[PDB]
């Protein structure tokens, strides 16, 4: 029956945001799915799920390349010029909402795409040695760096390292080569 | 002979293969023969000689489909000088859980502690190894040690009671 689609907007946008939370942001704990059904009683007796499938289809369709909003309106109209399609005002409303959560969606997609340990922060220290048990006088300095590594959804590991002048210079040279390779490949 | 050597856990596959090659015997028949002998001997050795007399033995072995000259070998292997070895290894098959391999301890007398200037509390350190390859080391205060000792003594007493009851309650 023609309930909600042409009448209520609040349930529709609520479902869109709940789906965004459920599928992109990784917070499926408590969603509006279980509350709207008994708080909004407009559940169709027979055809209630398949329209959620079109919800999912449109949600994934725009998630491909994130085009400029000038080109999103054309596709939204083309997909939605049929029965039960979204309105022009509602098309603008949903087009706005993409800007409201674009960067977060992209980051969650990249975050929910990682395959190896990622860098979650660098903390270092540079010291000056004095002496030891047998040695009585030393001045050569060192550097201490600790790496925050961890795959998404798992406890982070820590790695500690030691350095002196020569090795620091070598690492700086290697990073400089990395930068040069990054620079020369644009053209 | 090969079957008997197998009952002590030794690997003797190659000699069996050589015998099969020498005698021109299909594997399908050698395997069945080996299985038959192994099962027959295993069932025979379960019982003690008191529960299985030679008379009944060869009477059951009754000639139909049986040679007369092989039962002598069967009796010799069952009632020979190898029977003590077979029983000894057979006795070793009745085990489920690990047995104690060694037991070492060390008793200390705590004189001082960070949380107490003078403790003066006797303590016992225990290490235990098991046939599975497991090694365990732990502390054991005095009261827990007394509990353990009392439990061991009670178990000894009850085991003696069962040992007494076995003869009296089954020879009627």
């Amino acid at each position: 029956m023609a309930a909600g689609e042409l009448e209520g907007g609040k349930p529709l946008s609520g479902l869109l945001n709940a789906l965004a939370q459920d599928t992109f942001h990784g917070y499926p704990g408590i969603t509006e799915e279980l509350l709207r059904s008994q708080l909004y009683p407009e559940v169709p007796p027979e055809e209630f799920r398949p329209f959620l499938a079109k919800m999912r289809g449109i949600l994934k369709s725009i998630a491909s390349a994130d085009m400029d909003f000038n080109q999103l309106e054309a596709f939204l109209t083309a997909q939605t010029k049929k029965q039960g399609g979204i309105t022009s005002d509602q098309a603008a409303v949903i087009s706005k909402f993409w800007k409201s959560h674009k960067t977060k969606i992209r980051e969650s997609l990249m975050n929910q795409s990682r395959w190896n340990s990622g860098l979650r922060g660098l903390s270092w220290r540079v010291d000056g040695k004095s002496q030891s048990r047998h040695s009585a006088q030393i001045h050569t300095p060192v550097a201490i760096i600790e790496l925050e590594l961890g795959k998404y959804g798992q406890e982070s590991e820590f790695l500690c390292l030691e350095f002196d002048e020569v090795k620091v210079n070598q690492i700086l040279k290697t990073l400089s080569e990395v930068e040069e390779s990054i620079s020369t490949l644009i053209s | 002979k090969f079957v008997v050597s197998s009952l002590q856990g030794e690997d003797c596959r190659e000699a069996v293969q050589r015998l099969g090659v020498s005698a021109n015997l299909p594997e399908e028949q050698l395997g069945a023969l080996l299985a038959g002998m192994h099962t027959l001997l295993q069932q025979a050795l379960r019982l003690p000689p008191t529960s299985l007399k030679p008379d009944t033995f060869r009477d059951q072995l009754q000639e139909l489909c049986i040679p007369q000259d092989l039962v002598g070998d069967l009796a010799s292997v069952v009632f020979g000088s190898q029977r003590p070895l077979l029983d000894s290894v057979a006795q070793q098959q009745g085990a489920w859980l690990p047995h104690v391999a060694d037991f070492r301890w060390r008793v200390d007398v705590a004189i001082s502690t960070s949380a107490l200037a003078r403790s003066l509390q006797p303590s016992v350190l225990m290490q235990l190894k098991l046939s599975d390859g497991s090694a365990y080391r732990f502390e054991v205060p005095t009261a827990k040690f007394q509990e353990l000792r009392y439990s061991v003594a009670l178990v000894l007493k009850e085991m003696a009671d069962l040992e007494k009851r076995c003869e009296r309650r089954l020879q009627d």
């Binding site: 820590f158 | 004189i111 001082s112 960070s114």
Partner: protein, 66 residues
């Protein structure tokens, strides 16, 4: 972060009936990253004395600059 110790005397063992071997036990609460670990050690008398002397030396050397 934290440390504990226990100083005591042995009065026997599995293979010696009587012996008065002194010993010292330590527990070190070391912050192994975001987690915590405990390091349990045992020392003999000469080793403990040498450790104390070495710590005295480290204290002397650690207050030289300021």
């Amino acid at each position: 972060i934290d440390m504990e110790w226990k100083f005591g005397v042995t009065s026997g063992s599995s293979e010696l009936e009587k012996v008065g071997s002194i010993f010292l036990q330590l527990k070190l609460v070391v912050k192994k990253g975001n987690q915590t670990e405990n390091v349990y050690i045992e020392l003999t008398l000469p080793q403990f004395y040498s450790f104390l002397h070495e710590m005295e030396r480290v204290r002397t050397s650690m207050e030289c600059f300021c």
